[PDB]
Design an enzyme around this catalytic site. Structure first.
Site, short mmCIF file in Angstrom:
data_model
loop_
_atom_site.label_atom_id
_atom_site.label_comp_id
_atom_site.label_asym_id
_atom_site.label_seq_id
_atom_site.Cartn_x
_atom_site.Cartn_y
_atom_site.Cartn_z
CG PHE A 60 -1.95 -1.25 1.13
CD1 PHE A 60 -1.84 -2.63 1.53
CD2 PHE A 60 -3.27 -0.80 0.84
CE1 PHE A 60 -2.43 -3.58 1.00
CE2 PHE A 60 -4.26 -1.40 0.91
CZ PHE A 60 -3.50 -2.69 0.61
CB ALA A 61 2.42 3.59 -2.05
CB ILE A 62 -2.31 4.93 1.12
CG1 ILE A 62 -2.56 4.17 0.65
CG2 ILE A 62 -3.25 6.35 1.36
CD1 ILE A 62 -3.46 4.33 -0.07
CG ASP A 150 7.42 2.01 6.17
OD1 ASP A 150 6.81 1.40 5.82
OD2 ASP A 150 8.24 2.16 7.05
CG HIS A 170 8.47 -5.97 16.21
ND1 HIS A 170 9.66 -5.13 15.87
CD2 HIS A 170 7.11 -5.34 16.03
CE1 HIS A 170 9.45 -3.91 16.70
NE2 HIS A 170 7.24 -4.09 16.05
CD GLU A 240 3.31 -4.48 14.82
OE1 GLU A 240 3.64 -4.20 16.59
OE2 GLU A 240 3.84 -4.93 14.03
O1 UDP Z 1 0.36 7.52 4.86
C1 UDP Z 1 0.20 5.97 5.09
C2 UDP Z 1 0.02 6.07 6.35
C3 UDP Z 1 0.86 3.95 6.33
N1 UDP Z 1 0.78 3.21 4.23
C4 UDP Z 1 1.01 1.93 4.82
O2 UDP Z 1 0.86 1.58 5.50
C5 UDP Z 1 2.12 0.77 6.48
C6 UDP Z 1 2.56 0.94 7.66
O3 UDP Z 1 2.40 2.29 7.85
P1 UDP Z 1 3.85 3.08 8.32
O4 UDP Z 1 5.15 2.05 7.50
O5 UDP Z 1 4.11 4.30 8.97
O6 UDP Z 1 3.76 2.02 9.58
P2 UDP Z 1 5.88 2.30 11.08
O7 UDP Z 1 6.30 0.87 9.91
O8 UDP Z 1 5.79 3.48 10.63
O9 UDP Z 1 4.96 1.26 11.71
C7 UDP Z 1 3.06 2.05 5.24
O10 UDP Z 1 4.38 0.76 5.17
C8 UDP Z 1 2.37 1.34 4.07
O11 UDP Z 1 1.91 0.64 3.10
C9 UDP Z 1 -0.15 4.74 4.01
O12 UDP Z 1 0.69 3.69 2.43
N2 UDP Z 1 0.23 5.69 3.65
O1 GAL Z 2 5.88 -2.19 20.26
C1 GAL Z 2 5.15 -2.21 18.73
C2 GAL Z 2 5.27 -1.49 17.73
O2 GAL Z 2 7.23 -1.46 17.60
C3 GAL Z 2 7.73 -0.31 16.61
O3 GAL Z 2 8.94 -0.44 17.53
C4 GAL Z 2 7.02 -0.74 14.71
O4 GAL Z 2 7.71 1.23 14.63
C5 GAL Z 2 5.54 0.16 15.43
O5 GAL Z 2 5.10 0.29 14.35
C6 GAL Z 2 4.96 -1.50 16.79
O6 GAL Z 2 5.69 -2.04 15.79
MN MN Z 3 6.44 0.41 7.73
#
Ligand code: UDP
Ligand code: GAL
Ligand code: MN
Length: 291
Positions: A60-62, A150, A170, A240
């Protein structure tokens, strides 16, 4: 029906010599935990190419996250299932912002336009609904892999991950005791997991399986999120938290090690990781998640 493998010459596995002594390579429900040194990729590639396996990859790329597609896709071309048939499914609110990335033979990319939600939590959570598209995937691919955008591939990610249902450890929690996992702890949430339960903490950014099992998982997480929403509760880590509850109650048939979801800026390169295969791209959460 599976035909015979051809003759192959490779090192004999030695029963009285473990591939890895420093890590758990099988779960207590007999699912392999996939680390470098545990698999011969030549054997696995033969087994999967004889079945003409097609792998779908959802991403997803939003909104602003369309900026991550070019590196995501170009490194997926170098490292993700090379040799096999691959179908990328890019879900986006901006089809004209999808980069024109050159693909290897047997690989294809579909752009699927969806709506953009305002809150980054909803964008992330609604992937489960959006994935669960069901008829299309059953006809086009054998497995589905669902990842965050990302990210970049830095090393091999191949058929060693494929199985009916997998999650990924994780990278911040693989050495943690369960009471420290950040599961949803409020019993009012469908995602709730008590302090004395839990095998692993799986990351939302990389899961997958056969189409049927992935549609089961995303349908169950979406229905659980809907229940929570109606009850006025949002789980602590969104999709998650729900994925975690699902994989506690439906054990995955392989678990990927943190090779497969790493963050070198935050966690460095520990000796337990022989390869860093799929890694976070540095970003500023506040900026990229808002207009
Ligand atoms: O504005 C946004 C926010 C999230 N995402 C999608 O949701 C996934 C999970 O969000 P994010 O990577 O921000 O979560 P994080 O890894 O920083 O916890 C992203 O990789 C994208 O695929 C998106 O496309 N646009
Ligand atoms: O504790 C859970 C969280 O841990 C972070 O390190 C991660 O960036 C979040 O997306 C979530 O997984
Ligand atoms: Mn991410």
């Amino acid at each position: 029906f599976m035909v015979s493998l051809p003759r192959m010459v490779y090192p004999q596995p030695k029963v009285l010599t473990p591939c890895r002594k420093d890590v758990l390579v099988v779960t207590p429900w007999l699912a392999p935990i996939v680390w470098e040194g545990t698999f011969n990729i030549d054997i696995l590639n033969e087994q999967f190419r004889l079945q003409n396996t097609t792998i779908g990859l959802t991403v997803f790329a939003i909104k602003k996250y369309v900026a991550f597609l070019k590196l995501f896709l170009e490194t997926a071309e170098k490292h993700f299932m090379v040799g096999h048939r691959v179908h990328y499914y890019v879900f986006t609110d901006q089809p004209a912002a999808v980069p024109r990335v050159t693909l290897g033979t047997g690989r294809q990319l579909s752009v699927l336009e969806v709506r953009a939600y305002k809150r980054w939590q909803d964008v992330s959570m609604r992937r489960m609904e959006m994935i669960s598209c069901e008829r299309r995937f059953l006809s086009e691919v054998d497995y589905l892999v669902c990842v965050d955008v990302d990210m970049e591939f830095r090393d091999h990610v191949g058929v060693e991950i494929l199985t009916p249902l997998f999650g990924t450890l994780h990278p911040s929690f693989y050495g943690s005791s369960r009471e420290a996992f950040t599961y949803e702890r409020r019993p009012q949430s469908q995602a709730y997991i008590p302090k004395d339960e839990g095998d692993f903490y799986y990351m939302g950014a990389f899961f997958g399986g056969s189409v049927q099992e992935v549609q089961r998982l995303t349908r169950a997480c979406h229905q659980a999120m809907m229940v929570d929403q109606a009850n006025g509760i949002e789980a602590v880590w969104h999709d998650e938290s729900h994925l975690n509850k699902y994989l506690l109650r439906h054990k995955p048939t392989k678990v990927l090690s943190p090779e497969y979801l790493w963050d070198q800026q935050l966690l460095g390169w520990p000796a337990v990781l022989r390869k860093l295969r799929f890694t976070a791209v540095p970003k500023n959460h506040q900026a990229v998640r808002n207009p």
